[PDB]
Amino acid sequence: GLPVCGETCVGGTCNTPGCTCSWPVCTRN
Incomplete structure (x- = not known):
């Protein structure tokens, strides 16, 4: 998934x- x-x-x-922070990159659950 993109x-x-x-x-x-x-x-x-x-x-x-x-978007949630997921060090070192932000991503949306």
């Missing part, structure tokens, strides 16, 4: 609201 989110949560942050 991940909706893909922002690096290296700095403990996510751009897309709704």
Whole structure:
């Protein structure tokens, strides 16, 4: 499955609201 989110949560942050941080990458469950 193609991940909706893909922002690096290296700095403990996510751009897309709704995406959970899964260091070092944000992803939505």
